[PDB]
Write a protein that binds this ligand. Structure first.
Ligand code: NA
Length: 151
């Protein structure tokens, strides 16, 4: 019952180690540790972070995000040709941390962030982690590693 946390990236200066991007309709740039998604207008651009090898199953996704528009979070199984909408996130000027249960009943090898309104709103992502356990049971190894010196 020990949860496995998989840190996908903290600060990004490029595509996460062991991942490719199998989305469309965006350009990517990296500054301030953020993966900066620039969707093109009219494309509903997505970044689909594709594991080179293996799959996650269930549990929960943790990440920081700011975004000028609504963002659709998905997981996908490449082999089964199956997508699952995890959540749609409202616009925010400031980074907000989300921890979201993945209720998909299949393994997933892809985690996607999509420009839902398709108007080209930018999206900024940092600190992407997967846990095998639930959102309520998530003990963030990222925030824990900031305050370890104190308590
Ligand atoms: Na844009």
């Amino acid at each position: 019952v020990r949860a496995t946390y998989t840190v996908i990236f903290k600060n990004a200066s490029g595509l996460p180690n062991g991942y490719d991007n199998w989305g469309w309709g965006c350009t990517l740039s990296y500054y301030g540790g953020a993966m900066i998604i620039n969707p093109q207008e009219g494309k509903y651009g997505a970044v689909s972070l594709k594991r080179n090898s293996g799959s996650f199953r269930g549990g929960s996704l943790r990440f920081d995000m700011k975004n000028e528009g609504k963002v659709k979070i998905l997981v996908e199984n490449s082999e089964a040709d199956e997508k699952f909408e995890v959540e749609t996130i409202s616009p925010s000027d400031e980074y907000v941390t989300y921890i979201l249960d993945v209720d998909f009943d299949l393994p997933f090898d892809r985690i996607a962030f999509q420009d839902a309104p398709g108007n080209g709103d930018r999206i900024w992502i940092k600190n992407l982690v997967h846990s095998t356990g639930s959102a309520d049971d998530f003990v963030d190894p990222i925030n824990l590693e900031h305050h370890h010196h104190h308590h």
